[PDB]
CSV table of C-alpha atoms and ligand atoms in Angstrom, one decimal:
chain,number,residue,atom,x,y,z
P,1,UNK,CA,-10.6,1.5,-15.6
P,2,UNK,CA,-9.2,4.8,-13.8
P,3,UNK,CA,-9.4,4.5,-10.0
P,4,UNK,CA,-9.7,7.4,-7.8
P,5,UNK,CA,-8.4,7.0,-4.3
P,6,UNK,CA,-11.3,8.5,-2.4
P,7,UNK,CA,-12.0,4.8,-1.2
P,8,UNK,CA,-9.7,2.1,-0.6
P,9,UNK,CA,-9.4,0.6,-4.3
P,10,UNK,CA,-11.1,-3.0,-4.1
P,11,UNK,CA,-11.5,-5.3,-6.8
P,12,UNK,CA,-13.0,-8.1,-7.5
P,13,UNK,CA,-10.6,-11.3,-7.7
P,14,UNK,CA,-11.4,-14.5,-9.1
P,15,UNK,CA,-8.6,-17.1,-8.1
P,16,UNK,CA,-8.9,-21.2,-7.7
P,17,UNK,CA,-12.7,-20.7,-8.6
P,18,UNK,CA,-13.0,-18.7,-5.3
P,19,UNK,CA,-14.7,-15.0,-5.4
P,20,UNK,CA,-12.9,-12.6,-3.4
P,21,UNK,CA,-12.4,-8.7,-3.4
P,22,UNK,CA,-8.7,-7.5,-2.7
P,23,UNK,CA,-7.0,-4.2,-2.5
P,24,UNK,CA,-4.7,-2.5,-5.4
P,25,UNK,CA,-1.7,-1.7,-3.1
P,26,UNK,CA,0.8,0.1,-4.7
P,27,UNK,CA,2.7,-0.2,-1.6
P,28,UNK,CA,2.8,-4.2,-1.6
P,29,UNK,CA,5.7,-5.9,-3.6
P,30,UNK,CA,3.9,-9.0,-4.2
P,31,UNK,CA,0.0,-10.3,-3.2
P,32,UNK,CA,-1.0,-11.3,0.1
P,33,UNK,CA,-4.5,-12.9,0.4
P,34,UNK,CA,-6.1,-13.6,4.1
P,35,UNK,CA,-5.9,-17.8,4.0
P,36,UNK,CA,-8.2,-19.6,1.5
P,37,UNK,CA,-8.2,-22.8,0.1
P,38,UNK,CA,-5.5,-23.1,-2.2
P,39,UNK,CA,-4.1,-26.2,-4.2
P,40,UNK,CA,-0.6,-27.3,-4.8
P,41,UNK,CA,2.6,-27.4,-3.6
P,42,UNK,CA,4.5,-24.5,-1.3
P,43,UNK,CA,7.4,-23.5,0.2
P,44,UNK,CA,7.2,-21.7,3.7
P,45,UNK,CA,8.4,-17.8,4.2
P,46,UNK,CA,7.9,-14.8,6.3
P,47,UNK,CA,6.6,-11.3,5.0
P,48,UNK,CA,6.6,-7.6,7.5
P,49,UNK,CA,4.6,-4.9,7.2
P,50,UNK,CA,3.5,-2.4,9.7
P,51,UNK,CA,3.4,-3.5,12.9
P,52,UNK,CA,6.0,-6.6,12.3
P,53,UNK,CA,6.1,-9.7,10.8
P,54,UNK,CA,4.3,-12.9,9.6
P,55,UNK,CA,4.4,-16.3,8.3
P,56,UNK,CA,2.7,-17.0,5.0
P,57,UNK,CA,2.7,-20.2,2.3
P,58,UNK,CA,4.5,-19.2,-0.8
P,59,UNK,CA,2.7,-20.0,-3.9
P,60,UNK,CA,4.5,-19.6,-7.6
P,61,UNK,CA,2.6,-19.9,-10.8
P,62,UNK,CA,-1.0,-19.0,-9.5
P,63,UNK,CA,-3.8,-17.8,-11.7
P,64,UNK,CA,-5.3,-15.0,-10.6
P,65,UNK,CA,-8.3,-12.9,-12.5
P,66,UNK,CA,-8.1,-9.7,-11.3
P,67,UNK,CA,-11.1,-7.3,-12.4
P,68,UNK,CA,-11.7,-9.1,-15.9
P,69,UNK,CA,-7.5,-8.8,-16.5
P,70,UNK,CA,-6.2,-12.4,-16.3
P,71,UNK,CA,-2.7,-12.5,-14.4
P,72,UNK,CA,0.2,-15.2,-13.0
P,73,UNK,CA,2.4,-14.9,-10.5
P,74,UNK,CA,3.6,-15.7,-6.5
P,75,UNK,CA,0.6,-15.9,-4.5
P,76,UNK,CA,1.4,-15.5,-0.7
P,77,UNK,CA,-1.4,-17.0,2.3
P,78,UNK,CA,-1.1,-16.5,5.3
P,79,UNK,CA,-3.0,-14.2,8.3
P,80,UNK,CA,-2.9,-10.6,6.4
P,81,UNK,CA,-5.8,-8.7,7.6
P,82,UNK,CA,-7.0,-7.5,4.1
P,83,UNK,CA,-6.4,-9.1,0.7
P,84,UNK,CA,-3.5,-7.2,-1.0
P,85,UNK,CA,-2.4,-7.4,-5.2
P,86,UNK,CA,0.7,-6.2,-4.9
P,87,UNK,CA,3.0,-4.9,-7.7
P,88,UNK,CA,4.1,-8.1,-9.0
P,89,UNK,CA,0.7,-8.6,-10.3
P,90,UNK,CA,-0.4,-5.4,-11.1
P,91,UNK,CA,2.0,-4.9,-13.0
P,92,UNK,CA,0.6,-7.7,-15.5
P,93,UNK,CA,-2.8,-6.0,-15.9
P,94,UNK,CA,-1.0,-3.2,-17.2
P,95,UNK,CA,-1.6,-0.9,-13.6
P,96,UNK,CA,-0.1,2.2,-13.2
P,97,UNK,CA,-0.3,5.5,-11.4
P,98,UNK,CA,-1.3,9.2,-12.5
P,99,UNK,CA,-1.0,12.5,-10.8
Y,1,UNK,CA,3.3,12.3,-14.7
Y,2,UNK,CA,2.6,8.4,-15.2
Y,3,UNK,CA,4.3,6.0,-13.6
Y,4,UNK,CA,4.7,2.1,-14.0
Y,5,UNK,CA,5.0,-0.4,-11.1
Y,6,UNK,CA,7.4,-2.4,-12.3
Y,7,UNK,CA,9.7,-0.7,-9.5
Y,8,UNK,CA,8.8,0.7,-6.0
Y,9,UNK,CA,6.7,4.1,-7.0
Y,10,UNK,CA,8.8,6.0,-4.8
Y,11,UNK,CA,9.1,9.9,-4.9
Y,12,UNK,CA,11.0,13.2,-3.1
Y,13,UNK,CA,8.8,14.4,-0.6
Y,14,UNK,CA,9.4,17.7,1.1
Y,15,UNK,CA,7.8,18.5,4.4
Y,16,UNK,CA,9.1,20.0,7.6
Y,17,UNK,CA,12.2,21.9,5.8
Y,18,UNK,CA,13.8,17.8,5.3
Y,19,UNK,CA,13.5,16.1,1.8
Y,20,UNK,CA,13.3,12.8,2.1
Y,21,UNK,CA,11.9,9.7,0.1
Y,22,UNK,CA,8.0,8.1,0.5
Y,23,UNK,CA,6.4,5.3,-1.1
Y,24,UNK,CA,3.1,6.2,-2.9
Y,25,UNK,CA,0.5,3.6,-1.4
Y,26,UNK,CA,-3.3,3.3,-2.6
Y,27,UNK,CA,-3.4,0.8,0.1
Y,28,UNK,CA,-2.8,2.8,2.6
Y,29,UNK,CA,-5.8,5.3,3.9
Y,30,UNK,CA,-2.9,7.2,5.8
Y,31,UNK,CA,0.2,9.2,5.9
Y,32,UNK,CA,3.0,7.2,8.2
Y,33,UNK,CA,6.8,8.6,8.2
Y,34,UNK,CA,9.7,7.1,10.0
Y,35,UNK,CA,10.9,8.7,12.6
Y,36,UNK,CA,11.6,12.7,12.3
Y,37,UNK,CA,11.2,16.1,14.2
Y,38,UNK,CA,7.9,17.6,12.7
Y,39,UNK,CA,7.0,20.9,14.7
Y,40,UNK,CA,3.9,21.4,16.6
Y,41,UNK,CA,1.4,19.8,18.9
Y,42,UNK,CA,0.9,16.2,17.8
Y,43,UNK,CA,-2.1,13.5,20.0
Y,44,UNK,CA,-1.0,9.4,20.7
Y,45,UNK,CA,-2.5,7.1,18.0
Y,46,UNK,CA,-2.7,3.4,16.8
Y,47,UNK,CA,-2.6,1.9,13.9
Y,48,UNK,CA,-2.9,-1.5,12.3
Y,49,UNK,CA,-0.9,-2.8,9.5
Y,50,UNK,CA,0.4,-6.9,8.4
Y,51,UNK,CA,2.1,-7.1,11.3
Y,52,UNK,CA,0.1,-5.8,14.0
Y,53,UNK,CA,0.2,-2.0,15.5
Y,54,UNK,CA,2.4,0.5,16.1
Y,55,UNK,CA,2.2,3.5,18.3
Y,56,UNK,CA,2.7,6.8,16.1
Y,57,UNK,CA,1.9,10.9,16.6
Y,58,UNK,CA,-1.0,12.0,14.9
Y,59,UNK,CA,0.3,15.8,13.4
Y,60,UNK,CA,-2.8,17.8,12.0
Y,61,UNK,CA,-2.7,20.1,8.7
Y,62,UNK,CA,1.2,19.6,7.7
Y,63,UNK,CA,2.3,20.5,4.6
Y,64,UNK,CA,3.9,18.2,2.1
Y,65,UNK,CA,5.5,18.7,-1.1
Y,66,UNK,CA,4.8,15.8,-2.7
Y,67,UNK,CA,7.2,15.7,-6.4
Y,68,UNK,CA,6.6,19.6,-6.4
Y,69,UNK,CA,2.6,18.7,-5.6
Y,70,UNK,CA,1.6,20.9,-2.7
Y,71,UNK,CA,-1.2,19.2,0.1
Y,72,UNK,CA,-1.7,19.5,3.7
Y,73,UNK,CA,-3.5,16.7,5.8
Y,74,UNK,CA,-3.2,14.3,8.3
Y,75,UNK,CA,0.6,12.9,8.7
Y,76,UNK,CA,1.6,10.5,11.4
Y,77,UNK,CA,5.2,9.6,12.4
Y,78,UNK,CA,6.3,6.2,14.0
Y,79,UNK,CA,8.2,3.1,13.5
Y,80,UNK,CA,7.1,2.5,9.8
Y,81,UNK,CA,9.6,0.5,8.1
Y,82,UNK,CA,9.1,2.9,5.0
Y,83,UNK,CA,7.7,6.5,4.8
Y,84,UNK,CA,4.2,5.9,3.2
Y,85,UNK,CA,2.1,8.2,1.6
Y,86,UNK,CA,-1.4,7.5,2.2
Y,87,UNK,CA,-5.2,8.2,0.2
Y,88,UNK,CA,-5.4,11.4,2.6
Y,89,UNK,CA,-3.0,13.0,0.5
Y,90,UNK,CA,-3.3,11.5,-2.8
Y,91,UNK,CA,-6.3,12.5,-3.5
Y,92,UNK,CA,-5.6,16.1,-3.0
Y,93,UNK,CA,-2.6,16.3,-5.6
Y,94,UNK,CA,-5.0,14.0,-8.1
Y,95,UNK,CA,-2.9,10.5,-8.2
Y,96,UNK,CA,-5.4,8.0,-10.3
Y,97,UNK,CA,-5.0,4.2,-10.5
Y,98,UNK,CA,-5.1,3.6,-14.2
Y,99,UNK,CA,-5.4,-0.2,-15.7
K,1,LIG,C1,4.2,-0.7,4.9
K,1,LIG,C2,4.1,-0.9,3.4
K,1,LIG,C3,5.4,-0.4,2.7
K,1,LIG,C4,3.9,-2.4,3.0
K,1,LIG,N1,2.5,-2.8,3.1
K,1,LIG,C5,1.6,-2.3,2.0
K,1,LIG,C6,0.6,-1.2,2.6
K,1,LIG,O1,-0.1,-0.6,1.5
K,1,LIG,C7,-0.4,-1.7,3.7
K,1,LIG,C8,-1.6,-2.6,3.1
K,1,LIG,C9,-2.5,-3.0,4.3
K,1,LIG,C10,-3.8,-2.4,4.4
K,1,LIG,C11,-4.6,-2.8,5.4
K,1,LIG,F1,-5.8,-2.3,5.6
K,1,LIG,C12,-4.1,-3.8,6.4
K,1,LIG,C13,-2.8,-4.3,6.2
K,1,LIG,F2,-2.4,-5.2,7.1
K,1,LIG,C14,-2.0,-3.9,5.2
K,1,LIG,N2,-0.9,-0.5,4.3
K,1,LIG,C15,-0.7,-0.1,5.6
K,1,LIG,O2,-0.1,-0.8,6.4
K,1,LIG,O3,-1.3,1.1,5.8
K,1,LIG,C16,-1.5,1.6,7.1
K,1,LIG,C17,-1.6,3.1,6.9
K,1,LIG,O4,-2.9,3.4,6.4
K,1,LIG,C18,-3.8,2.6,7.1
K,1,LIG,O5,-4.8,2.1,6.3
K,1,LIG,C19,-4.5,0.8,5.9
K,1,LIG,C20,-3.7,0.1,7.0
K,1,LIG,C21,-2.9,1.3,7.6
K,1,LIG,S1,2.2,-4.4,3.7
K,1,LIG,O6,0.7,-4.7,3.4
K,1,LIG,O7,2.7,-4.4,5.1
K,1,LIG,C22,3.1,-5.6,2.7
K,1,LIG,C23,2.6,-6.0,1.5
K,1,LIG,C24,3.4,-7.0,0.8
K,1,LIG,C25,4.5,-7.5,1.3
K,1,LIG,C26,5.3,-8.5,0.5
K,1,LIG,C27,4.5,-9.8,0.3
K,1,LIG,O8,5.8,-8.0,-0.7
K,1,LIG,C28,5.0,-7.1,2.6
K,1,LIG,C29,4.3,-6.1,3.3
């Protein structure tokens, strides 16, 4: 649907079976999700933000269902305060800004 | 305008006299620009982002051109890696999420 930004702009996420609700962040080049239970293989890397740095599990190929719009892409895990889709993602949904 | 997020959404801001570049972020609820020389009183703030917090200037009722969209709010200046426009100001120049 079309989003205003008077509150943060949460969605509803289904990924690995898991329910969650994450945050369409414009601002984020890929999605960051606070650590769940993920399976399969990763590869180790570091992400900053505001505030610094830190260290999440890469994950490539991961289904994501992101407000009914089905989506694949690099999932990162690690201790983000807030569960971010990020513009490699959105993008896929077909996501875009209007002003 | 509409834009895609298959690259940063980046945009010419003017505020202060300075142009400079900021990142249009629907997960940010604030305004944070790097480092510049914003006149006026300003009050000691902290804010929390991936990384942790930083230690920015809270400046009341600026004005900001945002891509010749005029809006006045809340900015903060610190060690942001990137000049962020935040949901403070979007919603006054009318920026919608659209998917
Ligand atoms: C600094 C920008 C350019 C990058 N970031 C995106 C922003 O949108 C964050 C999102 C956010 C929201 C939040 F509630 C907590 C939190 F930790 C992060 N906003 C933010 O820091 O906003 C400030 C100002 O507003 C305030 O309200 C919200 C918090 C306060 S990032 O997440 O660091 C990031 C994402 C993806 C990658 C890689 C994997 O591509 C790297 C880094």
């Amino acid at each position: 649907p079309q989003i205003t930004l008077w509150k943060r702009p949460l969605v509803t996420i289904k990924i690995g079976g898991q329910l969650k609700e994450a945050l369409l962040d414009t601002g984020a080049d890929d999605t960051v999700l606070e650590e769940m239970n993920l399976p399969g293989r990763w590869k180790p890397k570091m992400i900053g933000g505001i505030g610094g740095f830190i260290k999440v599990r890469q994950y490539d190929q991961i289904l994501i269902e992101i407000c009914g719009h089905k989506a694949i892409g690099t999932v990162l895990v690690g201790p983000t305060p807030v569960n971010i889709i990020g513009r490699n993602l959105l993008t896929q949904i077909g996501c875009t800004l209007n002003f």
